Amino acid sequence: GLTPIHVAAFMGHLNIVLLLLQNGASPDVTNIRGETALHMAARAGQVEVVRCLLRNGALVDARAREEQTPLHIASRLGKTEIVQLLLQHMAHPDAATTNGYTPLHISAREGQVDVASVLLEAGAAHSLATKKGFTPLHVAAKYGSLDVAKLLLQRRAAADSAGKNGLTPLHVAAHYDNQKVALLLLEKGASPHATAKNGYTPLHIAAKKNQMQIASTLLNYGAETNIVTKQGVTPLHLASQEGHTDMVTLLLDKGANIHMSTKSGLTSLHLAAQEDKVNVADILTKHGADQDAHTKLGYTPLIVACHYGNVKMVNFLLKQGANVNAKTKNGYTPLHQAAQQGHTHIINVLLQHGAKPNATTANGNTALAIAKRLGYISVVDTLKVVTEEVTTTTTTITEKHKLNVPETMTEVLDV
């Protein structure tokens, strides 16, 4: 709901602004958004109008929607000369919007390095946190504002400030793949060891995203390879699950322990088995991974690969000597797991490698019986030739097929 001074100011009609003020118009009337003529002059870049309104007594820090001052607006649009004028008229450099963004946060988000330089020289606090804990350095790390991040760190902004979930700017830069900012933070002294609330380090993130240069530099600054999240996950687990062979090799080269398992018993080799990462599995095997490590429920990598139907991983694990007749704690063999999931092609490989078709689970079922109850006619037709007949009765104990699945790793970085 505009008044005449709002219109004149937005349009930059300096003659009309003076005419209105000369006749007693108040510079502080607001429109429906709570904006004054100064908000609108700033948004439109009207440097001379801004100077005239300030010199004629306008409220410098009038608050509009989201508690925005004219300084927030000028900073967002990179109106350096208007930022300077507002600060010279006592605009508070640390004024915060309702979400906690200061003009410095805004300049880091928009990559306005000239505005950030003016704010920092005028005394803006360089490390105030938003509601979620983000400092301007966190924002620069999320939006890849390298030149603003350089300025912040030159003014000794805190490189290790941690948000609500414990994320440091280095976490944020790695997560958002802003690799120059990550490398700058480390060179300027950011800790390579910082842990989020769930235990993620920057090395975990680098390992998961195959950020080879970041991982190398972290390791050069002393980062540990054998640290765990709250679920027991290591950087090597993450690299292995994703198939990042060069990352797996780098972490092993730098001391990673190939035998570490998660909370539920998953080793790196289980995760390669889950994701069919045969080249990873080869490297892990050459570094001594136990081909028959068991999860908490008793899944070996081979039974895991049978569950997910990963025949290349099945063939690879069999050639390394994995036990084709291994049993989970409730008696599932590779054959039972493949039967339950309908994987006829895996059934045929397992039978060729000596899987025992009459093996029974703890409840007494063969693989044939499990596939039969679940309607995998192709599996039944294959196992029929090689399995002893059993009669199914209504009293037959059947398996809990939804429970009889391998453990999985679902933990992720908390952003």
Residue numbers in the entry: 430 to 844
The paper states:
To ensure that we do not miss any possible residues forming the AI-c binding segment, we prepared a C-terminal 12 ANK repeats of AnkB followed by a 46-residue linker (aa 430–873), which covers a small part of AI-b, and solved the crystal structure of the protein at 1.95 Å resolution. The overall structure of our AnkB C-terminal 12 repeats-linker is very similar to that of AnkR_C12 (RMSD of 1.04 Å). However, our structure contains a longer linker folded back binding to the AnkB ANK repeats. A 20-residue linker (from Thr828 to Asp847 instead of 11 residues in AnkR_C12) is clearly defined, and this 20-residue linker extends to the repeat R18. Moreover, we observed a prominently positive-charged surface in the inner groove of R16-18 right next to Asp847, and the five residues following Asp847 are highly negatively charged and conserved (847DEEGDD852). We anticipate that this stretch of negatively charged residues is part of AI-c and involved in binding to MBD (likely R16-17 based on the length of the segment). In the AI-c folded-back structure, residues from AI-c form extensive hydrogen bonds with the residues in finger loops of ANK repeats. Perturbations of these hydrogen bonding interactions (e.g. the Asn834Lys substitution in AI-c or the Asn595Ala mutation in one of the ANK repeats finger loop) led to a few fold decreases in their bindings. Hydrophobic interactions also contribute to the AI-c autoinhibition. Met839 is buried in the hydrophobic pocket formed by Leu668 and Leu701; Leu843 interacts with sidechains of Leu597, Tyr630, and Ile635.
Ankyrins are a widely expressed scaffold protein family, which mainly function to link great varieties of functionally related but structurally diverse integral membrane proteins to the spectrin-based cytoskeletons. Each ankyrin contains an N-terminal membrane binding domain (MBD), which is composed of 24 ANK repeats and responsible for binding to diverse membrane targets. Following the MBD is an unstructured linker region of ~130 amino acid residues, followed sequentially by a ZU5-ZU5-UPA supramodule responsible for spectrin binding (SBD), a death domain (DD), and an intrinsically disordered C-terminal tail (CT) with varying lengths. We identified three distinct autoinhibitory segments from the intrinsically disordered linker and CT regions of AnkB, and elucidated the inhibition mechanism of these segments by detailed biochemical and structural investigations.
